[PDB]
């Protein structure tokens, strides 16, 4: 929340890394099928998308 | 839209204006008192054709202990400006001899722009007399064009840091060459 | 980091700007092939200190 919105410099969510993976491909990459993981993976995914 | 990050690296003999070229590109103000041996950790914003590119400019010097750490800058390099001095003919002939094979060795299939700096000094009386003392002349544009054809250069321009002549177009063409993603693979193994 | 707070980061940054080259200091990447590109910002975010 701070990185996306701060007066000095804002990291936009659409930037892609060397592989081309956006923040959402990266969040899928760490995604696992354990409850402890999915519980926050889905939350952060929805947060960033909205 | 989303700026694309491209890696630009400078390799040339000392005192040919590489650092000053990057500096004039960066702040557009010629430093008349202090010039660092290297210009480091900078990213500049440039737009050429509807695309917005952040160019990360690395710099390589060989004066003292930097040569040992030079190879480390070559990985993930997207585009190179091989630079030499117009008012110093000794710079040209070493480009095929020593600079080119190291560039090919560490990072092949990369675009390269061969440039000659400080157009003002070729017509300068002092430099002309100094070169004539050894029966020499400033690097002719024809020789630079021939070299650019000779060693596979993507383009050949000339810069002038003091007068800020042609820097914008030079780096524009550099990033235009960088944005091209080569041509697949050649003789790729079965 | 000692209990989440090191008393020398502000002093190092102050000395760096006072010495003329803040920019080159705050973002200096690693060079070893094993950690290439990692910045002090990456360490700050990873240590979980907003
Ligand atoms: N008069 C004049 N001098 C220049 C120009 N460009 C570079 N120089 C000189 O070249 C010297 C060294 O160039 P430098 O930037 O250090 O090149 P480097 O050794 O490859 O890093 C500087 O002291 C400048 O005074 C120019 O356009 N006009
Ligand atoms: Mg220098």
Swiss-Prot record, chain B:
Q: What is the effect of changing residue 19 to N?
A: Decreased Rho protein signal transduction. Decreased substrate adhesion-dependent cell spreading. Decreased stress fibers assembly. Decreased cytoplasmic microtubule organization
Q: How is its activity regulated?
A: Regulated by guanine nucleotide exchange factors (GEFs) which promote the exchange of bound GDP for free GTP, GTPase activating proteins (GAPs) which increase the GTP hydrolysis activity and GDP dissociation inhibitors which inhibit the dissociation of the nucleotide from the GTPase. Activated by GEFs such as ARHGEF2, ARHGEF3, ARHGEF28 and BCR. Inhibited by GAPs such as ARHGAP30. Inhibited by GDP dissociation inhibitors such as ARHGDIA.
Q: What clinical condition is it connected to? A: Ectodermal dysplasia with facial dysmorphism and acral, ocular, and brain anomalies: A neuroectodermal syndrome characterized by linear hypopigmentation, alopecia, apparently asymptomatic leukoencephalopathy, and facial, ocular, dental and acral anomalies. Patients show no intellectual or neurologic impairment.
Q: Where is the lipid attached (S-geranylgeranyl cysteine)?
A: 190
Corresponding gene? RHOA
- Chain positions found as Cysteine methyl ester: 190
What Enzyme Commission number(s) does the record list for this chain?
Answer: 3.6.5.2
The membrane topology noted for this protein in its Swiss-Prot or TrEMBL record is: Lipid-anchor
Descriptive protein name: Transforming protein RhoA
Q: Where on this chain is Effector region (motif)? A: 34-42
Swiss-Prot record, chain C:
Question: In which tissues is this gene expressed?
Answer: Found in the synoviocytes from patients with (RA) and without (CTR) rheumatoid arthritis (at protein level).
Q: Which domain of life is it from?
A: Eukaryota
- Where does the UniProt annotation locate this protein? Cell membrane; Apical cell membrane; Cell junction, Adherens junction; Cell projection, Cilium
**What post-translational events are described?**
N-glycosylated.
- Positions contributing to a 1,2-diacyl-sn-glycero-3-phospho-(1D-myo-inositol-4,5-bisphosphate) binding: 48-50
Positions that bind ATP:
35-38, 47
| Listed result of changing residue 31 to C | In HMND8 and CMT2C; does not affect channel localization to plasma membrane; results in increased agonist-induced channel activity and increased basal intracellular calcium concentration; decreases ATP-binding; no effect on protein stability; decreases binding to membranes enriched in phosphatidylinositol-2,4-bisphosphate; causes increased cell death
Q: What does the record say about domains?
A: The ANK repeat region mediates interaction with Ca(2+)-calmodulin and ATP binding. The ANK repeat region mediates interaction with phosphatidylinositol-4,5-bisphosphate and related phosphatidylinositides.
Q: How does it assemble?
A: Homotetramer. Self-associates in an isoform-specific manner. Isoform 1 and isoform 5 can oligomerize, but isoform 2, isoform 4 and isoform 6 cannot oligomerize. Interacts with calmodulin. Interacts with Map7 and Src family Tyr protein kinases LYN, SRC, FYN, HCK, LCK and YES. Interacts with CTNNB1. The TRPV4 and CTNNB1 complex can interact with CDH1. Interacts with PACSIN1, PACSIN2 and PACSIN3 (via SH3 domain). Part of a complex containing MLC1, AQP4, HEPACAM and ATP1B1. Interacts with ITPR3.
* General function of this protein: Non-selective calcium permeant cation channel involved in osmotic sensitivity and mechanosensitivity. Activation by exposure to hypotonicity within the physiological range exhibits an outward rectification. Also activated by heat, low pH, citrate and phorbol esters. Increase of intracellular Ca(2+) potentiates currents. Channel activity seems to be regulated by a calmodulin-dependent mechanism with a negative feedback mechanism. Promotes cell-cell junction formation in skin keratinocytes and plays an important role in the formation and/or maintenance of functional intercellular barriers.
Q: Which family does it belong to?
A: Belongs to the transient receptor (TC 1.A.4) family. TrpV subfamily. TRPV4 sub-subfamily.
- Look up the record and name the associated disease: Brachyolmia 3: A form of brachyolmia, a clinically and genetically heterogeneous skeletal dysplasia primarily affecting the spine and characterized by a short trunk, short stature, and platyspondyly. BCYM3 is an autosomal dominant form with severe scoliosis with or without kyphosis, and flattened irregular cervical vertebrae.
Q: What is this protein called?
A: Transient receptor potential cation channel subfamily V member 4
Name the source organism: Homo sapiens
What gene makes this protein?
A: TRPV4
């Amino acid at each position: 929340n701070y990185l996306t919105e701060n007066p000095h410099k804002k990291a936009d969510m659409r930037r892609q890394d060397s592989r081309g993976n956006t923040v959402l491909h990266a969040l899928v990459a760490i995604a696992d099928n354990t409850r402890e993981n999915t519980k926050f993976v889905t939350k952060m995914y929805d947060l960033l998308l909205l | 839209m989303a700026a694309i990050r491209k890696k630009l690296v400078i390799v040339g003999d000392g005192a040919c204006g590489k650092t000053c070229l990057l500096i004039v590109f960066s702040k557009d103000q010629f430093p008349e008192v202090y010039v660092p041996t290297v210009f480091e950790n900078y990213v500049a914003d440039i737009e050429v054709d509807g695309k917005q590119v952040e160019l990360a400019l690395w710099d390589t010097a060989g004066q003292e202990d930097y040569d040992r750490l030079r190879p480390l800058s070559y990985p993930d390099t997207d585009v190179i400006l091989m630079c030499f001095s117009i008012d110093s003919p000794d710079s040209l002939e070493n480009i095929p001899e020593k600079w080119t094979p190291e560039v090919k060795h560490f990072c092949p299939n990369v675009p390269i722009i061969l440039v000659g700096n400080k157009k003002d000094l070729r017509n300068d009386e002092h430099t002309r007399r100094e070169l004539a003392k050894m029966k020499q002349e400033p690097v002719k544009p024809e020789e630079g064009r021939d070299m650019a054809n000779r060693i596979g250069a993507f383009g050949y321009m000339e810069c002038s840091a003091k007068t800020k002549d042609g820097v914008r177009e030079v780096f524009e063409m550099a990033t235009r060459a960088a944005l091209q993603a080569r041509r697949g693979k050649k003789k790729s193994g079965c | 980091l000692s209990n989440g707070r090191n008393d020398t980061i502000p002093v190092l940054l102050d000395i760096a700007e006072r010495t003329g080259n803040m920019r080159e200091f705050i973002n200096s990447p690693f060079r070893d092939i094993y950690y290439r590109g990692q910045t002090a910002l990456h360490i700050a975010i990873e240590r979980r200190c907003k």
